[PDB]
Amino acid sequence: MIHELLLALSGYPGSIFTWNKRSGLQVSQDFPFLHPSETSVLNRLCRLGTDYIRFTEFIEQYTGGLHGIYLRAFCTGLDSVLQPYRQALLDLEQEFLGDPHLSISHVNYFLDQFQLLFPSVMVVVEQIKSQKIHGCQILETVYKHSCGGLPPVRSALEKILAVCHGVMYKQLSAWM
Amino acid sequence: MIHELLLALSGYPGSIFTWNKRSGLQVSQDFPFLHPSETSVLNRLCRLGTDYIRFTEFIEQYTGHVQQQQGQGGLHGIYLRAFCTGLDSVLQPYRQALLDLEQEFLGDPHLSISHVNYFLDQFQLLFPSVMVVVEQIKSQKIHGCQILETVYKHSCGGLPPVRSALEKILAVCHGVMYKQLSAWM
Amino acid sequence: PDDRSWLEHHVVHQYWTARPSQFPHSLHLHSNLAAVWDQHLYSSDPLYVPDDRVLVTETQVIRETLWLLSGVKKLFIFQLIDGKVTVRNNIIVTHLTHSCLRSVLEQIAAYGQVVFRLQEFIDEVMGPFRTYQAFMWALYKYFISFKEELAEIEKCIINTTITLAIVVDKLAPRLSQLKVLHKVFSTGVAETRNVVRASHLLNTLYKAILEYDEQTVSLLFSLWVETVRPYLQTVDEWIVHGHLWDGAREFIIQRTMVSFLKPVLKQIIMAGKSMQLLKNL
Amino acid sequence: LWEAALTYEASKRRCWERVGCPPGHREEPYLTEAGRDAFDKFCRLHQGELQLLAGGVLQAPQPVLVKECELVKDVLNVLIGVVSATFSLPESISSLLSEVAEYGTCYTRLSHFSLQPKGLVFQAFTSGLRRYLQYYRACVLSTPPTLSLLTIGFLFKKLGRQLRYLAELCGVAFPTGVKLLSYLYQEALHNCSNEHYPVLLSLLKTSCEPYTRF
Amino acid sequence: AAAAAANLNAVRETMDVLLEISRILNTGLDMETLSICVRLCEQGINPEALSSVIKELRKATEALK
Amino acid sequence: KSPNVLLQNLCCRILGRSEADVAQQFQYAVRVIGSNFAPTVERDEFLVAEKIKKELIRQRREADAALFSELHRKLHSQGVLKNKWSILYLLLSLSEDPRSYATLFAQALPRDAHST
Structure with missing residues (x-):
């Protein structure tokens, strides 16, 4: 249970958090020890998991229609923004092995900064797919949201952006 | 597990690793506590020992058993004895590696089966290459200088260990021809 | 006691042998989840017919997957169907509700099909082609360093917790590299004659290096050098020794096709033939 | 506390x-x-x-029991020549043991052929045979104090096969005199490039030292 | 046994949480002194009385330093 | 062990001196600890948790009070201790700055309304 949640967070939810193709991780299972209102808490948490699940598919196809080398670079920075999302998941199970009294609230406050990171990066990911931004105009489409206004999305899209600039110094070295 | 494996690998057959010429070396396979995970590692390891027993058996059978006198040159002759003489010096780094592993097992006897499988499968490629080269010479009764060709065609290969290994034996087999040529000319 | 105790200590046969495995631990739901989920089913009155479960313990799944990833088989979990490993639906650890398990062991199984196929390919060269044989040699040299990591993890089980999410993230720069060969090989088994089946495979590498001009490029570069070595030798023998030897017509020049030598090919042929014409004077 | x-x-x-x-x-x-x-x-x-x-x-x-070092000391005594507790006239140990045990059993039948201080050239030839037997008894207890069990079989492989070749050389019929002097020369013509070239040469070189005095 | 080591482990964990509480207040006491002060209060003792000797002795290890 | 030699161990811990070099301090120690070999008040472990909070806010070290809020849970979670009041009251008594009034703040239950 302290790995089922910490895998439903990652990419494997089982039958408690049944995945739906539109948006998944649905719960209807009953327990006396999970509070009747705690289903709403878990529903608040599953928003975080769905975005990571979609991110993994998007990285799975890369690294015609939409293609290039930028989709093999922009996804690679999307790895680097997700790395403190993996490290802080390992740290959690390490803590839960020792102390059994920590509840759902610990993962909730501890990973509360990705409820600003995940939606505001997810909108950029959806925008680049629904629109046809797949040449060297990718740096602009991220360059408007990298300014941010919330600090997680202010720091993440920069880390992705630097590699896209790095592709722009290999075209402009062969040319120049 | 420990010393029995190396005795089998060195070409001293075990009663755990029962030497056959119908199934090669084979573990007893009747202890109910041998892990089936271990079984495949043993199957990969036993091929090396089977090829090594074939090598030592060929060398003992054809060199030192007489005073260099059948009269078929694929079974006798100075060139053929010289092949065995080159072949045991080719087998030298296998000896070095086995000696090293025994020292490591003496230092700690808790080493893994994957460890000995990983270290010694640099010979896993070289051992299948040389078998057809010796098998051709024995079967076709190859005599004299045609043995040099039989080794020479497989020493121009695309596996570098096989290339170096067979080059040494062709140098050895040239030596006896040079010994006769140094008088006749 | 005396011999049975020696057995009971150093054997892990509870899934290698028919005996329901038990681990003595702290129980109560945080690790008792499978039992909790069964009890929830029964309290909801299904009425019965549960799943096939026989309970393995936690670390043993990891030992099992590490053996599959290093390359060996005869493995109870990840049962074969004709050579292809498939997820086992008759076992559970003590948690993961028997359906999450079916997903995550399936993803390791999906990697294991690739590894079994690569070892199957390397197996089918020992029982020359001058490029295919040269390619399995590079694949094998990489496979050595790949096997070393699986062995070192397997040692330190006896020497930290052992669980799934640590080992999956631990093998990230290998489970990435496994997918590139899945794409390289599809053009290498697309295949008529030995020289076009080889030029196809070689030209795939020659393209993919220009594609990313990471770690993937080191992989492809290590595949590229160790496949053109027989050709560099064969070019040198035709050039300096004069005579053309290209029997079985595996040499790409016959007195797809790679552009590794196309801008200088006129000078190559006019060098070799003229050396042969130097031998006749 | x-x-x-x-x-x-x-x-x-x-x-x-x-x-x-x-x-x-x-x-x-x-x-x-x-x-x-x-x-x-x-x-x-x-x-x-x-x-x-x-x-x-x-x-x-x-x-x-015998484990490794006891078994090594036993085979060291057999390499001196003298017989062990198991020879009269761990289960893979027999296969390794036979290869060096047969070397000891043929070494003793050369020393029995050196009991002498009949052929004049035969005496000088036997005095040359002792020049190799002294090496074989001298190398043991200066190379292998109590070293590894496989190391002994590998080490006395390059030296033991030559001893087995000399065991094929001796009869234990066997000739004596100028018949022996011709017999050894035909053995020189039989093999000249394996490992036994300096050994056979050094035996033949003193088997003709008395005949040249004639 | 195992429960004879589980208790000796189970008091080490608490003693280190107490040591963290001891260092975030940053009292000048260390673990060896703390090992006496824990043992004294299991038999029962007045904390206002042990604080009196410690508040005397820490200003007496400077007049005799 | 026994309490009397344990106090001598305390005297050799704080002072650098050994037990065969000082005897007036151990005499002062038997004077002060004596007839106070138990708490003279009633325990209120909740209030002494609140006093570490009331102290760390008073220093404006407000983050370590919220750290203590989790260490106190660890104290309950392990539960090898039946005297959590004594050591924590003592640790509060030996208070030192990492770097007002308590005459209106509540004190420990004195048992002046009960025959001791």
């Missing part, structure tokens, strides 16, 4: 399933990775199952 014991380091081998204090208690070690005692137990257990499948007619008492 309690606080004095308290200052210790607690074990790792953490377990996932223990949530209530998982320090470590070893989730069942691996069979090979507990070696050097499991090894001899496993050989003994197999020997017991083998003896069961026959009925006690494959019974060989002391399946363990």
Whole structure:
């Protein structure tokens, strides 16, 4: 249970958090020890998991229609923004092995900064797919949201952006 | 597990690793506590020992058993004895590696089966290459200088260990021809 | 006691042998989840017919997957169907509700099909082609360093917790590299004659290096050098020794096709033939 | 006393399933990775199952002991020439043991052929045979004090096969005089490039030292 | 046994949480002194009385330093 | 062990001196600890948790009070201790700055309304 949640967070939810193709991780299972209102808490948490699940598919196809080398670079920075999302998941199970009294609230406050990171990066990911931004105009489409206004999305899209600039110094070295 | 494996690998057959010429070396396979995970590692390891027993058996059978006198040159002759003489010096780094592993097992006897499988499968490629080269010479009764060709065609290969290994034996087999040529000319 | 105790200590046969495995631990739901989920089913009155479960313990799944990833088989979990490993639906650890398990062991199984196929390919060269044989040699040299990591993890089980999410993230720069060969090989088994089946495979590498001009490029570069070595030798023998030897017509020049030598090919042929014409004077 | 014991380091081998204090208690070690005692137990257990499948007619008492160094000292005494407790005139040990044991048994039949101080050239030839036997008894106890068991078989391989070649040379009919002087020359023409070239040459070189005096 | 080590482990964990509470207040006491002060209060003792000797002795290890 | 030698161990801990070099301080120690070999008040472990909070806010070290809020849970979670009041009251008594009034703040239950 302290790995089922910490895998439903990652990419494997089982039958408690049944995945739906539109948006998944649905719960209807009953327990006396999970509070009747705690289903709403878990529903608040599953928003975080769905975005990571979609991110993994998007990285799975890369690294015609939409293609290039930028989709093999922009996804690679999307790895680097997700790395403190993996490290802080390992740290959690390490803590839960020792102390059994920590509840759902610990993962909730501890990973509360990705409820600003995940939606505001997810909108950029959806925008680049629904629109046809797949040449060297990718740096602009991220360059408007990298300014941010919330600090997680202010720091993440920069880390992705630097590699896209790095592709722009290999075209402009062969040319120049 | 420990010393029995190396005795089998060195070409001293075990009663755990029962030497056959119908199934090669084979573990007893009747202890109910041998892990089936271990079984495949043993199957990969036993091929090396089977090829090594074939090598030592060929060398003992054809060199030192007489005073260099059948009269078929694929079974006798100075060139053929010289092949065995080159072949045991080719087998030298296998000896070095086995000696090293025994020292490591003496230092700690808790080493893994994957460890000995990983270290010694640099010979896993070289051992299948040389078998057809010796098998051709024995079967076709190859005599004299045609043995040099039989080794020479497989020493121009695309596996570098096989290339170096067979080059040494062709140098050895040239030596006896040079010994006769140094008088006749 | 005396011999049975020696057995009971150093054997892990509870899934290698028919005996329901038990681990003595702290129980109560945080690790008792499978039992909790069964009890929830029964309290909801299904009425019965549960799943096939026989309970393995936690670390043993990891030992099992590490053996599959290093390359060996005869493995109870990840049962074969004709050579292809498939997820086992008759076992559970003590948690993961028997359906999450079916997903995550399936993803390791999906990697294991690739590894079994690569070892199957390397197996089918020992029982020359001058490029295919040269390619399995590079694949094998990489496979050595790949096997070393699986062995070192397997040692330190006896020497930290052992669980799934640590080992999956631990093998990230290998489970990435496994997918590139899945794409390289599809053009290498697309295949008529030995020289076009080889030029196809070689030209795939020659393209993919220009594609990313990471770690993937080191992989492809290590595949590229160790496949053109027989050709560099064969070019040198035709050039300096004069005579053309290209029997079985595996040499790409016959007195797809790679552009590794196309801008200088006129000078190559006019060098070799003229050396042969130097031998006749 | 309690606080004095308290200052210790607690074990790792953490377990996932223990949530209530998982320090470590070893989730069942691996069979090979507990070696050097499991090894001899496993050989003994197999020997017991083998003896069961026959009925006690494959019974060989002391399946363990001699271990390694005792077995090495035993084979060192056999390499001096003298016989052991098992020779009259661990179960893979027999296959390794036979290869060096036969070397000892043919070494003794050369020393028995050097009991002499009949042929004049035969005496000088025997005095040359002792020049190799002295090497064979001198190299043992200066190279192998109590070294590794496989090391002895590998080390006396390059030297032992030559001794077996000399065992084919001696008769133990056997000629004497100028017949022996011709017999050795035909042995010179038979083999000239294996390893036995300086040895056969050095025997032949003193087998003709008295004949030139004539 | 195992429960004879589980208790000695179970008091080490608490003693280190107490040591963290001891260092975030940053009292000048260390673990060896703390080992006496824990043992004294299991038999029962007045904390206002032990604080009196410690508040005397820490200013007496400077007049005799 | 026994309490009397344990106090001598305390005297050799704080002072650098050994027990065969000082005897007036151990005499002062038997004077002060004596007839106070138990708490003279009633325990209120909740209030002494609140006093570490009321102290760390008073220092404006407000983050370590919220750290203590989790260490106190660890104290309950392990539960090898039946005297959590004594050591924590003592640790509060030996208070030192990492770097007002308590005459209106509540004190420990004195048992002046009960025959001791």
